[PDB]
């Protein structure tokens, strides 16, 4: 790990503490592309805006309220899990998982969610043909749609509001909702697939991880960070970074991967020591931070079980199993086991 140099246009950043540091000043590193690059919503939004989007949905992901999804997350994880053999635990698991509780969780019948996740997909770089131009069009539809029908799950939240001085905008709520679901059925499909990695490579740390399933989860997001990086950050004026002087304007490209392997942070970070003590950037940290963390955490945690307890042992045929090969996120594309 070096210091922050610049290159292809951008600083990188491989360093715990001018990672950490990086986000954690805002007012300076606008998480805005302040001109034009093209996440949406309250993602590419700063400090004192941002909060007043992030609001909106943000008493809906606390920890005691997604809680209260606690048995529907291992109600669907069981059925899942209950075949899905032979099968690629990809596509039929970690996709079917998150793609679920978010679906819910927001006001997406299970009828949209084939569409939805194939949406995303394309979205977070993990799909592309001419065919996009209209799943784009052939959804915001479908979305446009689910803002009229009813219930009280996020999209009608969503709907019938706005806040300040201001009505929120019918494009700026279909892009909040656009937010959760590349949030919702993605990212977590990864934190999954690289615990079951974390279970090949190391054999027998099973009946620990049961014991702690958590603290397990938890190392996971520090040793497979599911999102290696991110890249949209940008120098709102001239500042520093060790002894670099970032030009304001300049594209600043944290990668978080790397910072979670900090040898400065984590003792013998190498390894998969369960219950270190200190957090890991994986969840970012900041205004910004993750308001899915304490959703992932738990389906992470539920199907980790569901998983652990269904296999007796845990080999993975690599002869068909392949780790998508897009370097801003780690995770895999197919997982077969045996
Ligand atoms: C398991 C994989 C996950 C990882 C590693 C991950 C990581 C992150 C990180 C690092 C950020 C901040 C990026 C920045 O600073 O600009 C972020 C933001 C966010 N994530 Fe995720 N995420 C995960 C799961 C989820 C889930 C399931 C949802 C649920 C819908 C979600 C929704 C969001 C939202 C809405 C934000 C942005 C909040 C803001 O603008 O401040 N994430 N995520
Ligand atoms: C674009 C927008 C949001 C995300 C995301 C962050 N956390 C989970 N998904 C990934 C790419």
Sequence with gaps: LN????????????????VK?????????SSNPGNRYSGISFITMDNPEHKEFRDISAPYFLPSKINDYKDFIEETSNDLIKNIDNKDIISEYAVRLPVNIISKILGIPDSDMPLFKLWSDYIIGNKRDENFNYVNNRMVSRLLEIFKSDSHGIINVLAGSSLKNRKLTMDEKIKYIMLLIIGGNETTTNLIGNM???????????????????????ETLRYYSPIQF??????????????????????????LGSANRDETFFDEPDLFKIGRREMHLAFGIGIHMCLG?????????????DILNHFKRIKIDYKKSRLLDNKMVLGYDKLFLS
């Design 21 to 29: 540091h990086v986000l954690m000043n805002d007012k300076i590193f």
């Design 293 to 305: 963390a304490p959703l992932a955490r738990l389906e992470a945690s539920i199907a980790l079980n």
């Design 3 to 18: 210091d922050p140099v610049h290159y292809d246009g951008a600083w990188h950043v491989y360093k715990y503490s001018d």
């Design 230 to 255: 991110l890249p949209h950050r940008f120098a709102a004026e001239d500042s520093y970074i060790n002894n670099k002087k970032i030009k304001k304007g300049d594209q600043v490209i944290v990668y």
């Design 196 to 218: 079951i990695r974390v279970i090949d490579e190391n054999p027998d740390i099973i009946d620990d991880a049961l014991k702690n399933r958590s603290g397990f989860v938890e």
